[PDB]
């Protein structure tokens, strides 16, 4: 017999409350056990009043350095080593979130992008970007091309010009820099340059949306297609042969990507440590927890080593684990905070065809010293 057994679920997407809403009809069944569903607004404040007490649950979801990232500089719920044991799950996947020498992150959604293929009238990924143009001159020779995306979209031409050369911290081996920055550079200025000249050299004007740019690839099937916060599922699909592929190099590497897992758990555990574990072990993660979301609200899968032989199945994770198996994981660099308002006057100024790169980037050599 259980007491109270009442739990505060935060999430607001499009999706899930249905799902979880039956997880909960089924333990309160026993005698005790009703949980609830909303969405974050007020949360922010309400954080810092219900950190010490508030009411009594709390568990939120969100992206990895969102909860992750935040909590572990707060008052997350350090599990301890011990599941690990008789779970046997991936050392990588543990490592990925090993802070000091705590657990201060719980990956239930992995979500990424990734670039499909045909194995029909789609040729594949030749080497590097160089070679693009070489597929877009023989597409077109019969009736196709070979690059369709939008241009001015967030999240994209960042990483592009961020892993080309230089533009925060320069990365060797797998190490990032503290007080060196590398933005006034020629690698950080070519690539700023070929991307903003893409477009002043097409049409100059820039008359492309989000839904028309990409209404280009989605108008038939040309030999760039990627998928993001639009439409991860849709029930089935049929197109005889499709697969996922990595994003190709350019000038020595590709862009700089990275997991999107999704931190959800208790704070400091507070709570009910014991149920809270117990709870997100025994009625989340697991056969039948997974089997709400999963059916009610599909999206991604875990990252468990015995459903993963069956979850392979699925291009969601196949695409993940892709980038995922050298490494893939956003870093924190507060400083990028600031650079947002930046990368904007810097991108969205060059792009009205007044302005050029070099004002940006002079100018911010200056002001991000001094």
Not at 296 to 306: E, I, T, Y
């Amino acid at each position: 017999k259980t007491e109270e057994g009442k739990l505060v679920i935060w999430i607001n997407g499009d999706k899930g409350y249905n799902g979880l809403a039956e997880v909960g009809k089924k333990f309160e069944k026993d005698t005790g056990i009703k949980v609830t569903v909303e969405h974050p607004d007020k949360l922010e404040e309400k954080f810092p009043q219900v950190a010490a007490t508030g009411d009594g649950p709390d568990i939120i979801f969100w992206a990895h350095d969102r909860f992750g990232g935040y909590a572990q500089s707060g008052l997350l719920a350090e599990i301890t080593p011990d599941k690990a044991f008789q779970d046997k799950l991936y050392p990588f996947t543990w490592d990925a979130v090993r802070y000091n020498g705590k657990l201060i992150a719980y990956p239930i959604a992995v979500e990424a992008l990734s670039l499909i293929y045909n194995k029909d009238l789609l040729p594949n990924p030749p080497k590097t970007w160089e070679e693009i143009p070489a597929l877009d001159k023989e597409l077109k020779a019969k009736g196709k091309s070979a690059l369709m995306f939008n241009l001015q979209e967030p999240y994209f031409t960042w990483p592009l010009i961020a892993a080309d050369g230089g533009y925060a911290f320069k990365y060797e081996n797998g190490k990032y820099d503290i007080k060196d920055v590398g933005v006034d550079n020629a690698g950080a200025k070519a690539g700023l340059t070929f991307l903003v000249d893409l477009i002043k050299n097409k049409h100059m004007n820039a008359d492309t949306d989000y839904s028309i740019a990409e209404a280009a690839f989605n108008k038939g099937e040309t030999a760039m297609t990627i998928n993001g916060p639009w439409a991860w599922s849709n029930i089935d699909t049929s197109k005889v042969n499709y697969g996922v592929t990595v994003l190709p190099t350019f000038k020595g590497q590709p862009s700089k990507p990275f997991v999107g897992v999704l931190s959800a758990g208790i704070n400091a555990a507070s709570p009910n440590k014991e149920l809270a574990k117990e709870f997100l072990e025994n009625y989340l993660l697991t056969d039948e927890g997974l089997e709400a979301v999963n059916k009610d609200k599909p999206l991604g899968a875990v990252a468990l080593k015995s459903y993963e032989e069956e979850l392979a199945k699925d291009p969601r994770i196949a695409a993940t684990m892709e980038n995922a198996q050298k490494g893939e994981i956003m870093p924190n660099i507060p400083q990028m905070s600031a650079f947002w308002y930046a990368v904007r006057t810097a991108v969205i100024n060059a792009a009205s065809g007044r302005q050029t790169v070099d004002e940006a980037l002079k100018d911010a050599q200056t002001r991000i010293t001094k």
